[PDB]
Amino acid sequence: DYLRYLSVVRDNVRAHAAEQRAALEWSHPEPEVLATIPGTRRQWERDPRDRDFLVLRAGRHDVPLDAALKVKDTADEIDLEPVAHSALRGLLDVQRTVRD
Amino acid sequence: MRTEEVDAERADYLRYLSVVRDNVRAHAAEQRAALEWSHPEPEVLATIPGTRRQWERDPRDRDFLVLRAGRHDVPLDAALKVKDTADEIDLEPVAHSALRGLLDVQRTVRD
């Protein structure tokens, strides 16, 4: 049951990371696409009201996933289940960093 | 109730008390380290007046005008409190003996 719940929250975290990389690939294309930009209707597009303004692409690395991913661990060091907590520790360390 | 279940319970409680014993011994070593730093033996303090640490005791300190005479059982200024909600004492007879042993021996620092 707990690993089914962990698969559900892994699906949700992967959806958050997919939306974040989709926004970051809309707002910072690879430095070959932007020769086709200045003809169409998207050249002078970044207003100072939009959350990307005077922010420049240097490359691709591990953006740290601006979603929270906070467990509500409230117990006073009660020892956890050795396969559920291992899977949660495996989820909170390789899904909390988006790839390149 | 099987005796195997209370044996595993006794083992888990004694492992918890072993970790609390290690932490209390760390507290006692820190308290003795502070007391030996601020009150060294009467053969080391020949080297004190030369260095940059001779007249170091100021009237804002917790060890100021405290003249070191000797060493005996300093009482471990941390608490060692048990949250004794287990009223009507019929506790586990080995798991109760080790708590009294730790609360009686380790509550005082040695020399």
Binding site: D79 | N23, A26, A86
Partner: protein
């Protein structure tokens, strides 16, 4: 009820807890390994890892009850002679 005591291990803050050096396997570790290897073998064969009903354990326990019926038939036909 009886106010039991769950398994606890606090942080150490002391140079003894880094010195265990022993590998001894509990009942919980071997049961967790049984669960992981029954989730992987129900994850490369059944291709769904929800582990509601595991059919591989059903088949393997079926052939194990076959071998157990063999052993009980042997101990039943040995005491006949």
């Amino acid at each position: 009820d009886r106010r039991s005591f769950s398994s606890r291990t606090p942080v150490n803050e002391n140079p003894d807890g880094v010195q265990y050096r022993r590998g001894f396997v509990t009942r919980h570790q071997v049961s967790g390994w049984r669960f992981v290897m029954r989730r992987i073998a129900s994850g490369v064969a059944l291709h769904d890892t929800r582990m509601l009903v595991d059919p591989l354990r059903t088949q393997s326990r079926a052939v194990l009850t076959g071998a157990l019926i063999l052993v009980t038939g042997l101990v039943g036909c040995f005491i006949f002679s």
